[PDB]
Design a protein around this ligand. Sequence first.
Ligand SMILES: COc1cccc(CNC(=O)c2ccc3c(c2)OCc2cnccc2-3)c1
Ligand SMILES: COc1cccc(CNC(=O)c2ccc3c(c2)OCc2cnccc2-3)c1
Ligand SMILES: [Cl-]
Lengths: 377, 376
Amino acid sequence: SRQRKLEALIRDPRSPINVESLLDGLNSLVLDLDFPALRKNKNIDNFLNRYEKIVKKIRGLQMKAEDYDVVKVIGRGAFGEVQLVRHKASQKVYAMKLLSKFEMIKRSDSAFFWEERDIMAFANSPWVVQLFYAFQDDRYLYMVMEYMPGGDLVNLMSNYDVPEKWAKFYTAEVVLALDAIHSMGLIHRDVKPDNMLLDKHGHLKLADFGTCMKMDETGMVHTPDYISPEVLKFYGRECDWWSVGVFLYEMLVGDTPFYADSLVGTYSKIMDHKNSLCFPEDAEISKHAKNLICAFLTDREVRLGRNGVEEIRQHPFFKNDQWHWDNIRETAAPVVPELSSDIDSSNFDDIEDVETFPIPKAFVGNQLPFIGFTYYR
Amino acid sequence: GASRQRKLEALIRDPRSPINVESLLDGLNSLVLDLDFPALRKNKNIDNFLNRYEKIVKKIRGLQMKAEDYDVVKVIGRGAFGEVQLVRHKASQKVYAMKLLSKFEMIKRSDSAFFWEERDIMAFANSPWVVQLFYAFQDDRYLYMVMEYMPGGDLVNLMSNYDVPEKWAKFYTAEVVLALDAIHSMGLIHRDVKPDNMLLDKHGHLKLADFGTCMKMDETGMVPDYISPEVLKSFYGRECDWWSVGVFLYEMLVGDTPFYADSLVGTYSKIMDHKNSLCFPEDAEISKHAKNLICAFLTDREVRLGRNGVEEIRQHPFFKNDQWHWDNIRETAAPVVPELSSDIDSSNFDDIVETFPIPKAFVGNQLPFIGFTYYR
Ligand SMILES: COc1cccc(CNC(=O)c2ccc3c(c2)OCc2cnccc2-3)c1
Ligand SMILES: COc1cccc(CNC(=O)c2ccc3c(c2)OCc2cnccc2-3)c1
Ligand SMILES: [Cl-]
């Protein structure tokens, strides 16, 4: 039936015409028309009068920023911040990412959040931070995610001298996490320890999917210290595997392989990786660890990971007496976080602390790029 | 928390709700229609939104009810903003009457709100006295209302083919009285009761149609040939519909309207002067009870029959008969039962476009029609 086919489209949570997206369309239409200049048009003024009471009722019922208490700012980004929040009714703690609609439109970057929201909402993977809710108001997009109290791998590296047994565990967990992202047809493009978070048990999850891109049928897609040579000079999955080599080097050596005083010096060192990569003589690194770093830090054509993840899995570096690839996330992590409460943000450094869209004379549609963002798990 | 999500889901499930799924799909369709113009697509916000919703909106347009699902058999009615066609649904092969309303003419002639009560009365009355609406759909040019076809025609047609005896006039007046009481009970005043809007079903029984003038009454009960004097001298009560019933009973029995004149102004002058202009011709075959009932309706609003409710009308001596009771009249044999040769026989009906300009900026011509779609 045509009515059955149409009702199936609205029930689908991945559908652009689900009830949440249809409510976004109505909310956005009201937001973009409720201006004194536009209200001079009888069509616009009468429509706003008809939908005024129901839209105000809907606004009070739907999820909003006022349903959460902001505890602390635990992160900052180009377009907003990440807050540690507590839901006022349920008393449950989450991490909430905010994205400024004004900054996203002004800096012509207003489409990256679709894949970010979808990866977190629909991955169903223990390696990806879960999104519970996605909602919005006139100024921001909000993403309510699981809070990772263990902090990131930048914080871990600065508080510990990482032994090779630990480095082996974290690299293996990054490998499985990137294999999960790659299996969903995506390339991360920003693999760095700042985006590798640890949960309450010390296990890894990836976060910040703002650079993720869906790869085409060929498996292709059209940060200075972690950027690969091919992006500096049309990239595939092995672009993410470069960053894993840089990460394993930073963990074992204590410094980045292509560190330099200037940004141009660092770029020059990455282009010259065939001669600029060298392990310090004091370095306490095994032959297998140097071999694995070197297999990742090569030109894209011969790089480890180009032919999937099976070649990475069988590398001799990963041989150990604690875990297997099928059970690594259910074994004891090297560092188990010592938390004093559900809002303990001691594994996060303190963050140091406004503009709106101009009132329009004619219809501009600033809310239109955000229709369909709302999602409730 | 979950109470908020329950309250919100109840609002969308409600078929009377302005935010039901049909209304939410109208909002998306209208937004796409009002933005898909080359001039507006210069704006990146508009162009990118239309690119995102292009495939899904085309899919929705093919699945949703459209004029192409019906075969037009004949035009059986005409009106200010459109026409009523006798149509056949292509898939089910079922016959309906479909009223069309031009969005362009309704906007141009600043009359774009009357259809809300009309659609609601027909969709939700659940009364044998009101024409039933099955579907309400719309495209870029028209609003459509798919209703049950009344093959018996209207009472204008009945009056021109028959010399109506008083026993028949009693039956049709009693059915109009019950039909009006049903509308009054729903909190509405018709304001245009006339035999053109009184239709007969396949069995010869009455149903009212054309609810374009209906208005919801306040807590106080307040809001040419058939209009009351108080309506002409312009707040109206339900007794302005009872005036129309007196005019109808007079036309049925006498053969002419009580305030007929060659011109519209002549008719208006006669209605204002009803105290002296109303007179029964000496050759009119009418009883004393029939004249008394017509006179009780054709008075000033203050003393008019039906002002204090329908009970006073029901107990009038004119309605005394040995054929029906008020509780069963619609289940007794009608005076004239239609003889139809097929499901598209329209023998009881006499035989019977400017578009919006392409805009340079957002005008929102589809906005007044959001929420019209309804599927029974
Ligand atoms: C482009 O505009 C922005 C705006 C705001 C932040 C970012 C980058 N930062 C992030 O995206 C980010 C950072 C930390 C977390 C996170 C995401 O989600 C999971 C999570 C759980 N527990 C603790 C922390 C996190 C980018
Ligand atoms: C103000 O713009 C318009 C536009 C079009 C028509 C009218 C007046 N006409 C009507 O509203 C109307 C309503 C229902 C029926 C009808 C006419 O005649 C035939 C018929 C047969 N079977 C069932 C129902 C009907 C007014
Ligand atoms: Cl009786």
